[PDB]
Amino acid sequence: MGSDIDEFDLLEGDEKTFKQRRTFEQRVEDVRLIREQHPTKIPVIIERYKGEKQLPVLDKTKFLVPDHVNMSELIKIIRRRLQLNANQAFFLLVNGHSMVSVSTPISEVYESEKDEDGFLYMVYASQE
């Protein structure tokens, strides 16, 4: 049944991510330097989800966030910089998932979710 149907994979010939722009050792050294001059700030990479067509792009991917800022405030900041409408869905995903704990300091989040290179990576999307 339906055995007469064959499948084909569709190829497409279509601003690289931070990990692609910088080597692992370069990123580690960046984090070391940041740790040295801004010991109360957290280095965060924030990028648009690759497949996201609804939300716009930030022209900046690399951020320093004060330790005390929680995810709620950061979501608000990012939504603000994106100039989103109040009713537009937005998700800030860390290690591929949204944060259950939206009230804790980003330094606390950092200690759990940081990459091996020392950056905390986030991706934003209109789903999850």
CATH number assigned to the domain comprising residue 113? 3.10.20.90
CB 57 within 8 A of CB 83: no
The dihedral through the CA atoms of 86, 45, 41, 91 has a sign that is positive
| Given resolution (angstroms) | 1.9
Of the candidates 62, 49, 118, 117, the residue with the CA atom closest to the CA atom of residue 89: 49
Method by which this entry was solved: X-ray
- CB-CB neighbours of 119 under 10 Å: 23
Range of the domain at 87: 1-128
Overall number of domains in the chain: 1
Q: How far apart are CA 45 and CA 121, in angstroms?
A: 5
